[PDB]
Structures are given as structure tokens and as C-alpha cells.
Amino acid sequence: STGSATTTPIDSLDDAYITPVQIGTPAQTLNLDFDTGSSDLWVFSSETTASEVDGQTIYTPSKSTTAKLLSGATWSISYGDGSSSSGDVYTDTVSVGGLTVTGQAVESAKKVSSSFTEDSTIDGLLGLAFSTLNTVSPTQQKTFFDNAKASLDSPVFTADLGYHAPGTYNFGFIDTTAYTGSITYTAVSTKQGFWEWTSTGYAVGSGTFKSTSIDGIADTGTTLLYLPATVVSAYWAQVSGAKSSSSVGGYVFPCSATLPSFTFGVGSARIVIPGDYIDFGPISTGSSSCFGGIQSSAGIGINIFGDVALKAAFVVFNGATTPTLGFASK
Secondary structure (H helix, E strand, C coil): CCEEEEEEECCCCCCCEEEEEEECCCCEEEEEEEECCCCCEEECECCCCHHHCCCCCCECHHHCCCCEEEEEEEEEEECCCCCEEEEEEEEEEEEECCEEEEEEEEEEEEEECHHHHHCCCCCEEEECCCHHHCCCECCCCCCHHHHHHHHCCCCEEEEECCCCCCEEEEECCCCCCCCCCCCEEEECECCCCCCEEEEEEEEECCCCCEEEEEEEEECCCCCCEEECHHHHHHHHCCCCCCEEECCCCEEEEECCCCCCCEEEEECCEEEEECHHHHEEEECCCCCCEEEECEEECCCCCCEEECHHHHCCCEEEEECCCCCEEEEECC
């Protein structure tokens, strides 16, 4: 089997991407944030504290003939941006782009933090990191990908995120029309539960490539590119007037700037992030200070190849017995 679903930016900045997902019988379609940095499939629901729902579409298990309470199971998750959610668990039929999993754990939110409430466009998350990170207790649950894997034509999914445009998540096949040149594969460590890999270096604009190992995660659920302070300083030093602002919470730059590109290494291959991808616009409405899309990972404890990086590539998440990551230009 295979699946193919379009993913769409939630706003004009590509802050996140939503993908329609069918849950239950008859289908209830919710727009979920596919997150390769976490491993819970959770949804706004008929159980979510009413004051914490503001425009989201909810899953109502009582209206699904295939829903079953997973008795005694609870979940609770905290994300890198400090947001969180928690609740109980149903199993139900879940389909993505024509690919169906029966018995998928669907984590129903009883509580969500303010950032989730405030984002009316995101009805929940669909985790695509390794199932060892799943938070369901006392019986840990598998991700949608883990459950689908045996049925897939090939044990893979691909992320093809757009810049200010829709893109695609595919399951079970590699669309050879969706990228240019060849795919370069690189080793993954699953020790922390992430799609963790080592970039071979970077360049700023038309500058020379610096060969240096940068361990980080491929995380579709993080907006920006978070890299070591040395790398990030070297980038912003090439933008007149750019500075790190503690009051704003990172590097800012004059909105009048033309940003240089940023290149990262994948083995001997190179992925180029155009300068425009690094512009996250005014820090507040009407400001002439703009927020940068490359930020320091110092004090996160991990480097994160978030959407800024990933949307510059066609990315293969290879879930074979020895997992690997593939990157191609597009």
C-alpha cells in the first residue's frame, strides 16, 4: 500500500504545515501537524476543556462506530517550545492520503496549552519520530508510520514541504518526479528517539564550505533552523545590522536586508536554503525589525533541522531495519 497527502502552510510565514487526516467511521477529517520530532497522534476532541477550544475541528469518538476506549491509558506531552497537552486514549481507524491503519492509538486531549488553543488551524499532531518517544502510559503506543510500515510497498515516508506553498507527505514510495539529481542518504541514530543525523558542514552565501560535523534532528514540527552559536554568528555577521536580541528572543535583522543563502552538507552533497526562506518577517506588526529563520540551539541541547532547512529539500525518512535519512535538491 501507499498514501499521498498534501500539506499546506497554516499562515503566510510557513509557521507550520497541516495535512488532512481521516479518523473514525464515518470519517471525521481533522487537519494535523505532522511532526517528525515527536511520536504521539493527539487531537482536539469532544473531551477537550471547552475554554481551551477556539475554532479547531474536534474528534468525537462517540460518533465513530470503530472507536474504542483504550481503558486506563493516559498521555501527557511537553514540547520544545514549552507547549503541552494531555488526555486519554481511543483506538480507531486512521487514514492519511488513502493509506489506512486500523487500531491506531488516537490520543484525545482533555487539556491543551495556550499556544494550541490560539492556533485555530491545527486540530492536533501526528507524530512521526520513533515510537520509543510515545508518551502513552502504562502501555506505550506505536506511531501511524510504525503501524503502517509492514503494509507499505517500501518502509519509508517522504516530506516535500513548500516555501509559501503546499507540498506533500508520501508513505510507502519515493516519487522520483518530485526531486532533481540524486538522493544522498546518511546514517541515523535512534538513541534519543529522533531522526538524528550528522551534517558534514555549512556555507554562508557564496562563501567557502566549512567542513564540520553537526549532529541534529530532522524535525518537521519545528519552524526554524537551530544550529550551534558559532555557525549562527557566522551567518548573521553577513547581514548588515543583524544582532541577537534577548528582548525579542533571538537574531533579528533589518527588514530592508537581502539575506544570504545558507548551505548545509549531507555527506558530499549540499542543500542550499535560499535567503528568502530565512525571513520570518516583522517581529511585531509594522516593525522594521525582522525575525531570523536561523537561530542558536545553545540551551536547547540539540541542533534542529526544522522546516526552514527541510523545505529546501526532498527528504526521505527511511524506516528500514537500519533507518537512514535521504536528502535531494528539488
